[PDB]
Design a protein around this ligand. Structure first.
Ligand code: 717
Ligand code: 717
Ligand code: 717
Ligand code: CYT
Ligand code: CYT
Ligand code: CYT
Ligand code: ZN
Ligand code: ZN
Ligand code: ZN
Lengths: 151, 158, 154
């Protein structure tokens, strides 16, 4: 019936002395993402896609720059409050390193639990940047997301 | 229930001596976006998402940067023509979402006005239109303030 | 009804010595993409189809070991796995970002290839072309990016 689509984008720098947390998963690595929160680039992109589908603005407006899962849960709350139900989420992480493949199902599990969705409605994809640009040089990590909701 | 989705992308350089026009809003700034038309990166991205959802090709095709009739073209006029062609193809627009990526200036004070322009041009209520603002966290040409990028998504139904 | 959306991204470097193949179409150029055929557009569309189906990604379905298959063979196999998970493809839209060469003359051919491979009416497949306005590695002609979106229904 009243379907809406949303899209999200995020990028953070990789810096020494920070933990690397993506999709709620702490991944062993010598650098981590820099941000005012835990800098979970994946969760932020999904969050923006959800706000965007519900026409509620953006993550910058809702949570002025701690735990990104808490923010994702709050986002899901605001989406429900606006009268929408989430139908599915898809996403991509662009990181030259480290290897993300072993952690993906954990990420999906986290996101599914945070959005109160079954696993089959949550997806997370991994890509390198084929050594191009700042992502290619491992200076940051990007995430992209898409969300479908219904009123 | 014949739904279709589309996506769009655009980027333009930020240069001295040009109006900064994003989402139809003239924003006070010392630089502006360089292009053949008014170079409204956000409206272009949305226009491409709508043409894309309707499988009508793209804005480069409909409103060519090689055709002199679009020199300094009002991108809201282009967006309204896109919406007309989308309607004529048989599609109704259900919603639009978008992102602008810029180091500067601060876009937040202008976002609501952008949403209102897009809503007006697409004949949608405000609650079916969204615009989001992002920095690029200081990375790359966007982080260096060399250009501004926009992304869009649209849902339509035949 | 049970609609789902998916999105996809891909980028390959652009250097002398390889054919330029985008959307199944070989395009005369002084350079080409590095990868198989390195078909950036087919890869992104393949990723958006798997993501709409919540089946992971092209890296997981089609790794470097398992044959030699070109990117259209992968798109078709992608499409068959999507169907067995219960989903029908409703449409695909995409954008190729390349500073050069001119892609517009080749779009009809890419759409035809994609629609054939996905068994879709032509009017549910779209491909768009963008430059990067001379910004970044894309704008210096050091690589080509593709973006895709797909809608499916169970
Ligand atoms: O652009 C990086 C970024 C800023 N911000 C504010 C809330 S979540 C988030 N990610
Ligand atoms: O890539 C910048 C660009 C080209 N073009 C043609 C019509 S609107 C527009 N934006
Ligand atoms: O990053 C370029 C790339 C990697 N990969 C794996 C399967 S298809 C494909 N394209
Ligand atoms: N960093 C990564 C990129 C792509 N695939 C992975 O598994 N990891
Ligand atoms: N350029 C901007 C990025 C993020 N937020 C803003 O308000 N403006
Ligand atoms: N490389 C290209 C970018 C934009 N339009 C084209 O036709 N080709
Ligand atoms: Zn973030
Ligand atoms: Zn433009
Ligand atoms: Zn590829």
């Amino acid at each position: 019936m009243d379907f809406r689509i949303g899209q999200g984008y995020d990028v953070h720098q990789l810096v020494p002395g920070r933990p690397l947390i993506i999709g709620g998963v702490t991944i062993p690595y010598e650098r981590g993402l820099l941000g005012h929160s835990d800098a979970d680039v994946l969760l932020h992109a999904i969050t923006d896609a959800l706000f965007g589908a519900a026409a509620l603005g953006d993550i910058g407006r809702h949570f002025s720059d701690a735990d990104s899962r808490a923010l994702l849960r709050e986002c899901a709350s605001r989406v429900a409050q606006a009268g929408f139900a989430i139908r599915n989420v898809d996403s991509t992480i662009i990181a030259q390193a480290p290897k993300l493949a072993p952690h993906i199902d954990a990420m999906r599990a986290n996101i599914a639990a945070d959005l109160d969705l079954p696993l089959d409605r949550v997806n997370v994809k991994a890509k390198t940047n084929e050594k191009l640009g700042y992502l290619g040089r491992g200076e940051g990590i990007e995430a992209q997301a898409a969300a479908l909701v219904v009123r």
